[PDB]
């Protein structure tokens, strides 16, 4: 089972297509679901082509055998969501990996900020260095950590907000977590940010 694409940007009024491939051939035993964040899934279409009562007519399912398409015509604001196919020819019942449809807007470069650990965090015995990428679009972004101008992997974690309801951007935190002894066996700390809105990777840094 293979659902594509993994993600998709569109505007209100567009027509979107999502596809599911099931190479073993599953006749018409496929359904489509919609899911919004923090909510239960909703069945849109079953038996490949049947629209569930109460689901808007702008949703249409097609296919038989190996390739299946969900077409969402004239996208409405309520349609920005994640979509999943489900195969039920055989057990185990299996879902596709999902397709997130988000809102298209113009490219916006992140504003990048770096936060040096407070004295009290250093007395903590564990220090967290935070790099903020603020209000960017599209979602795709890359963060690398550099200590003493040298690459560091393994001790960072990323967290991202949902698309902002006012300006349709994302924000992301990258947190580098080290022991106090380790925190400054080092001198200079930096994070380099790569994004489509930057003509070249931006680095913000500190030392002390």
């Amino acid at each position: 089972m293979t659902q594509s694409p993994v993600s998709l940007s569109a505007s209100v009024g567009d027509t979107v297509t999502i596809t599911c491939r099931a190479s073993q051939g599953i006749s018409s035993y496929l359904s489509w679901y919609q899911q919004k964040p923090g909510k239960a899934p909703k069945l849109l279409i079953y038996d490949s082509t049947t629209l569930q009562g109460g689901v808007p007519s702008r949703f249409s399912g097609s296919g038989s055998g190996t390739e299946f398409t969900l077409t969402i015509s004239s996208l409405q604001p309520e349609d920005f969501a994640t979509y999943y196919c489900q195969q039920y020819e055989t057990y185990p019942i299996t879902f596709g990996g999902g397709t997130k449809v988000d809102i298209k807007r113009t490219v916006a470069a992140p504003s990048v900020f770096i936060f040096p650990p407070s004295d009290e965090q250093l007395k903590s015995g564990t220090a967290s260095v935070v790099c903020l990428l603020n209000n960017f679009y599209p979602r795709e972004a890359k963060v690398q950590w550099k200590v003493d101008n040298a690459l560091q992997s393994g001790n960072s974690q990323e967290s991202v907000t949902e698309q902002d309801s006012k300006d349709s951007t994302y924000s992301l935190s990258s947190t580098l977590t080290l022991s106090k002894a380790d925190y400054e066996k080092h001198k200079v700390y930096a994070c380099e940010v790569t994004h489509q809105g930057l003509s070249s990777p931006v680095t913000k840094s500190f030392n002390r």
Binding site: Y29, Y46, Y88, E89
Partner: peptide
């Protein structure tokens, strides 16, 4: 079929 495909 299985799941909702076997309710009948």
């Amino acid at each position: 079929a299985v799941g909702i495909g076997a309710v009948f």
